[PDB]
Amino acid sequence: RVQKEGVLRVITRNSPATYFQDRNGETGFEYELAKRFAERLGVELKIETADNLDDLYAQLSREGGPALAAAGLTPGREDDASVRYSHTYLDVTPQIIYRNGQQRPTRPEDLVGKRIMVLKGSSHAEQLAELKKQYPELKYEESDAVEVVDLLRMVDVGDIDLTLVDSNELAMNQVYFPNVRVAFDFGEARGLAWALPGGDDDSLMNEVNAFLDQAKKEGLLQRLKDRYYGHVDVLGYVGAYTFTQHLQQRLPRYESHFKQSGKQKDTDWRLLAAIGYQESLWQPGATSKTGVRGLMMLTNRTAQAMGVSNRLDPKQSIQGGSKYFVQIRSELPESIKEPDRSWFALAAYNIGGAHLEDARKMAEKEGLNPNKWLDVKKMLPRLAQKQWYAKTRYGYARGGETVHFVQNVRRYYDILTWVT
């Protein structure tokens, strides 16, 4: 149904480990992997999102359902003839997670008597079900309305005692949940794999395993792993002493560019400089595994849109990035007034106008003022909680990092203004 039709249907979940929207559009480990596969087949990729894992598999099991599921799945139900799995493309280990400073369980038996929650329909729920056969007084909860990020949050704040998640999910999310710790590894290391329908037409799964084998030997899987695991997102605030050191050493080299851009766009050059600092620490050669480059950290698409032929040129980067900011600011709803308007533009610069509008709609529904940054800033963190983001048009986003981004830039801006 793919080439003769031209379209590969892939079902996944909306989560930071698989598939989500950022300011540049669709992104995520599974998205990119599936995107590369689609290209290899020379067809168009179309992502479908399941509301939950039972739903994902149920769609995959339907006659005429999606071609495959790319969703951080573990091979399970080895008799469920309705579903077959590919070769593995990422090794993970399931881990019991607890809150730092609380009592650490060390053996499966220690899970008895604790509040545990896992995703409904997950292989981790099945691990607990199996364990419950050996220890019938084991109790655990499963939900369709939470994602792994929510489970880690619940441990972090103590709403639950424990959860059980794959090591890759912890690796990606650990920095955002300072209190959570691995209690112990629960199960042997296993490979993640794509799921395809049963179970007669071997054609697609031949393609899939050939693709995955090549992706490995060719290093794509490693580069995907590096890009999505270990990255910082938004640089943390550097503090007074480091900022002055760069004020001293770096800013004078680019100061004339910021001012000229400020003049041409009739905007405060120090706000432009503050963005540049948050993005690259004023390093015109800065690069990322995420595809951004240069002083203002532009994508190729945005660079091309802004008339930038060389993202590594400080003057072009500053001019293009500044034009992009002012354009975003100019395009905001007229009801948002300065100075809030500039703060919203900073938010959109980082998270994209789509997620920001979701946050404004959520603020309005909450009874808050969608034209006040102080109010909308309170909504952004909710975009990382499935109960809230599943209700939005564009779904999941690490909204709290956008809050940090804006706060950092405003602090640098304030300091630059003071040192004049």
Instruction: Give the residue numbers marked as catalytic.
Output: 279
Distance of alpha carbon 332 from the chain centroid: 24
Give the other-Cβ count within 10 Å of 201's Cβ.
11
Name the region of 152 (left: φ>0; alpha: ψ -120 to 50; beta: rest). Answer: alpha
Contact by Cβ (8 Å): 14, 383? no
User: Residue 7 pairs with which residues in a beta bridge?
Assistant: 44
d(CA 177, CA 155): 9
Which string of b and e fits 332-371 if b means at least 16 CB within 10 Å?
Answer: beeebeeebbbbbbbbbbbbbbbbbbbbbbbbeeeebebb
* Distance between CA atoms of residues 247 and 263, nearest Å: 21
What is d(CA 174, CA 186) in angstroms, rounded to the nearest whole number? Answer: 18
